[PDB]
Design a protein around this ligand. Sequence first.
Ligand SMILES: [Mg+2]
Ligand SMILES: [Mg+2]
Ligand SMILES: [Mg+2]
Ligand SMILES: [Mg+2]
Ligand SMILES: [Mg+2]
Ligand SMILES: [Mg+2]
Ligand SMILES: [Mg+2]
Ligand SMILES: [Mg+2]
Ligand SMILES: [Mg+2]
Ligand SMILES: [Mg+2]
Ligand SMILES: [Mg+2]
Ligand SMILES: [Mg+2]
Ligand SMILES: [Mg+2]
Ligand SMILES: [Mg+2]
Ligand SMILES: [Mg+2]
Ligand SMILES: [Mg+2]
Ligand SMILES: [Mg+2]
Lengths: 141, 55, 206, 59, 56, 143, 70, 145, 63, 67
Amino acid sequence: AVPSVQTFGKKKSATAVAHVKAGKGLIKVNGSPITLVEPEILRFKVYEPLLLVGLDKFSNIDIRVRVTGGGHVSQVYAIRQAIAKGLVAYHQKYVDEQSKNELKKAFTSYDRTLLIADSRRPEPKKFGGKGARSRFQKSYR
Amino acid sequence: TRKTPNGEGSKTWETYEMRIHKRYIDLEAPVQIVKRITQITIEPGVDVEVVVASN
Amino acid sequence: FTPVVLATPIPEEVQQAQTEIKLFNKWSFEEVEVKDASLVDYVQVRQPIFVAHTAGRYANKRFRKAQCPIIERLTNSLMMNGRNNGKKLKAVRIIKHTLDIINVLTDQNPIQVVVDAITNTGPREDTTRVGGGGAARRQAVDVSPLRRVNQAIALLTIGAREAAFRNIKTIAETLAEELINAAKGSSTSYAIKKKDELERVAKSNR
Amino acid sequence: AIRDKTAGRRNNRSKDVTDSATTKKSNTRRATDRHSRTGKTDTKKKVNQGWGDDKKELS
Amino acid sequence: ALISKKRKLVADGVFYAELNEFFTRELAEEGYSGVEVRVTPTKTEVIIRATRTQDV
Amino acid sequence: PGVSVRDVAAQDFINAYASFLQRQGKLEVPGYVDIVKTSSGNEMPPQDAEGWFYKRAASVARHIYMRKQVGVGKLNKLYGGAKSRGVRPYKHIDASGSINRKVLQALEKIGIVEISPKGGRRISENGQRDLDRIAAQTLEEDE
Amino acid sequence: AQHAVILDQEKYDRILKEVPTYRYVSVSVLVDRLKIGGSLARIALRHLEKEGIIKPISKHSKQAIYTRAT
Amino acid sequence: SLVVQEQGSFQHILRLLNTNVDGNIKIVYALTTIKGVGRRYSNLVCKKADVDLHKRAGELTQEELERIVQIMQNPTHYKIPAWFLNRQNDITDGKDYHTLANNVESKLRDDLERLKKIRAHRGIRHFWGLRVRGQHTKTTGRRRA
Amino acid sequence: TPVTLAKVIKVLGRTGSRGGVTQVRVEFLEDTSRTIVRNVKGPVRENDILVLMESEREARRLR
Amino acid sequence: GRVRTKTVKRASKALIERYYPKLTLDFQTNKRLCDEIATIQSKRLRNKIAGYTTHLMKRIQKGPVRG
RNA sequence: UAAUUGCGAUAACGAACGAGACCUUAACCUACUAAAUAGUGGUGCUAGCAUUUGCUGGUUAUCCACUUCUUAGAGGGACUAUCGGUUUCAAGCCGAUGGAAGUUUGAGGCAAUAACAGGUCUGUGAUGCCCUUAGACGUUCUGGGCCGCACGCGCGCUACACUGACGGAGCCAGCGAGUCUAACCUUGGCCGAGAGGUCUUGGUAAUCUUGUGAAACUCCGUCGUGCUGGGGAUAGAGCAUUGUAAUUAUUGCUCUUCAACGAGGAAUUCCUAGUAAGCGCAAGUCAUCAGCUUGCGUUGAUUACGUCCCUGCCCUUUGUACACACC
Ligand SMILES: [Mg+2]
Ligand SMILES: [Mg+2]
Ligand SMILES: [Mg+2]
Ligand SMILES: [Mg+2]
Ligand SMILES: [Mg+2]
Ligand SMILES: [Mg+2]
Ligand SMILES: [Mg+2]
Ligand SMILES: [Mg+2]
Ligand SMILES: [Mg+2]
Ligand SMILES: [Mg+2]
Ligand SMILES: [Mg+2]
Ligand SMILES: [Mg+2]
Ligand SMILES: [Mg+2]
Ligand SMILES: [Mg+2]
Ligand SMILES: [Mg+2]
Ligand SMILES: [Mg+2]
Ligand SMILES: [Mg+2]
């Protein structure tokens, strides 16, 4: 066996599972390299963890992620979270603490909920309107 | 369902619901204990269904 | 910048820029200082961003809305007029195009030009309707900084979305135009005229 | 049906809309809702016999 | 036999509903308070809870 | 270094494999092509005229390259899109079960796809070979 | 129908001599100079890119952009 | 594609099938100013006549035009599916037709008269200028006649 | 054109019958030790900076 | 708006009344007290109760408190 | 304070119903118990590209191990905590840090006393009285009718386009539901332009439909501001499906026809965060029919975080000759 950690990240419904094992540094999303990922204007959102912490952090580790569920955007925010959570979970159990508390510190600074799963979520709609807050319409008489 | 029996009022909807929980447990045993275990452990309200084999 | 390659390759200018400087699509957050007093704290620029999209929670409190990066404040107000309600991917690309357009003309980090057009269209004072008995005079009021950034954001995008309506020019061409004229205000822009007209009515009652 | 004149669009199109088409709720008796029309009333004996009265409470 | 689990328990409740009705009319003068139905091997047991058993 | 088709971006792979299937001439392009509309929920036939059967053959290929097994029905639902019902709200509608089945058959006759067990159509062992090939050939244009 | 659907040999050379000093050239900008509807306007963008002049610093459908040659 | 040049060769506004058609529009939507020829029907005909849709109605060698006319009024000979056609199984002779130009007005008269002469309720409805297809006429359809 | 910058010192309250207007005292940062109470339009917290377009005038109540 | 009910402020009364030589200004330990010392019917009422007896405790250390 | 929620003032003290508590649902558990009807890694068997090991797949049991992801049992967790401002330094409020979470955590369920001639005898084999009871107001059967169109009102759907239509192409959810004494949900193979047809197939279901490959949306082209290829009413002609029955056209497809509408007067509805709006989906109804409804997720803002000006109602004080209570 080789050192490895599994992590995940979630935005709305989307859950992005991650596997961080010691390796030659591939970064792959479901089947494919992190340089595709498109929507593609959002691409730098999933780049963000690699760049904030520097690209050299990935040379001793292999990175794969599979995103079930969510939608064409929520999937992009779910993966980037599992990538950062995975990089920090590795220095948790494998390299030392001070390296990990240096990584969290430089994700948390900039951030966008990179280690922390956002709490927002659809509210139930209720009878009398098509929306959650929305009511329908009334003319009185 | 609409709460009203008939027509009138701001239209109030009230959703009833019933929850069904289903478990299954796999055992390997003899003929005797299967019958000893199925006849007893009788409970009203819980539906026990014991199938057999591998296919 | 001391390059690197692990297995799956990371492209060259992508590898390069990020590690060194953390910048825009590609654009400078360094330099680009707010050109008017106040209007800082109420225009962001540092912390820098790659592209304007965020899961940001800017709603839950009164003034955390101001802390939103300013460019995304400009994109956010693009996507609306309910056919376009939602569609931030739509707007973000229009902005990237828009910035690239402004960049073409007169150099100037266009993010800074955006900082300039916002500073230059915010009404310094305005009027409201006082009751004072029925027929209502106008008590002129100086308007808050937050409402000077907000109104500028609304005034700029609306004037371009209204002008770009029914003609060949794309939103990003008029958005950039409307900003270019309002970066140093020429009074040829929809936004500037409304700023100067509100400040005229506030001066005309007092 | 086809032969008969005084039929079809163009004929109705040239007539005039009655003003009963534009009228309103008409409502016919609301402010009398509380006022019982029966003219019966009841009595204090017949209610106290059915529902019992506060003077016999002890027993 | 062969009826789905969802449709089973539903019909099981409707069966209880029709059962409790038929007794509440039939045992009225007997103080009928309710039932429960235990299902077993060999048997389906129905207990009539009334306040007067010597009449039932 | 080694190559998959997953290592190439979505469109440049389907543009390449279209030009290749076009360069080839070994196709089976049924011939109601140019006259048909591709879906009930569509309006005009494709603007590719001569073409677009290679585009959909390429598209169908890569899709079956990805996964275990897919059929004609799956490709209808996949390839279909929102139908404008006129003055009534939009509804998703499946595309034609002919174009796709004829694309599967043609690509089977040309040996990029086979009739998989359990159901449907599987990527051919020869399809892996040739698709991974042209994938690299497009990655190699960027060299 | 208002002129910009065609070639008109004097027009071709106009595009040749009229596109320095344009910091901006695109679909709209080509029509803006009183010519070239957005069909053949787009064709001039790929053709002025055959050699010289326009620099492709912008990508895709709808929005186009190019600056002067250096 | 290609910047083209030409000279004086193309004419704007060329007349065919008893209607007038502007040049300087892209030929597929140009033919649609004839009656009976839809966007689909124009598209199939040009694909059949060996013409480039890239061209406008402007250039279009004179030979290509007569060919284009030919296929239009003879769809079933030129291998056009006949479910593509606005009159299938006719009414009298049963042949599949595509009724073209000022003729589609005629057949609208023809059929409308057929129901009327037969006294069928559908014609009765056309006589009164109502909606035939069976929609409620209470609310909708007011300005109209 | 004499720009006059003034820093909100405190938040006095909401005037106007509507109530969008706020009452605030402001110390101008160019020559402090002098104060004016102003009426704002948009929302305001402590230590903001208003632009007084004309330096000397002030109101109190709004109906 | 968070305003504790009377049952919460009433129970904190009797608790600081007789159990002061116990508890503390740490919520967490007071919470565990209200299990071993008191019978409440839910986890939420108890954290609510104990959370407020912690507050009443926290201010008794500076100045008396009526009740 | 959301609250007769509390602090405080106090001839009142101390309580009960109702609010709260409680319950349900969505957020957090690398801690607990597990899972071939959920899923991961190793391994065989194996395909493709590369080869230096690599990369990308196939394979309901060929085996081993795991429970992060999924499922739901038991627990845990938040009490507006810490600190600081503000205040009768009171209940509280506000800010910052931390936190899954700090607007009653979000959203619902439940909800006292009382009142209304509110609605419902057209849900009931709940019912009083009245009416009718065989040339029936019982009941069934044939056909029509609720749809009938000079026109007034209201809920809505689709647009007036270029933040767009169209054509390729990328390709991503959640709430659901499905056939026994029966014909429900439908994969796949063919045939058909399509609608559909047809031969088989799994599923009484986390097992099969179904990863519901949904739609908006993203990408590359075509059109280029012209009532234009925006828009799809009206109408003709043909092909199919449900049904004993489709004419007054149940629904679906193909062709053609190509209207009004160039942002809407006076007015007026709805809404503060994953909300509004844009977007579809499933369920209800259902033989066939959604432009409706009940829920669902997708994309995802602008602007308040205030007041009593408008409108509405609640509370005090006050008047009363009302109390069947200003009808
Ligand atoms: Mg799709
Ligand atoms: Mg598509
Ligand atoms: Mg036509
Ligand atoms: Mg007290
Ligand atoms: Mg209570
Ligand atoms: Mg778990
Ligand atoms: Mg925080
Ligand atoms: Mg009444
Ligand atoms: Mg009766
Ligand atoms: Mg009716
Ligand atoms: Mg499209
Ligand atoms: Mg038109
Ligand atoms: Mg159209
Ligand atoms: Mg059904
Ligand atoms: Mg339905
Ligand atoms: Mg209904
Ligand atoms: Mg009195």
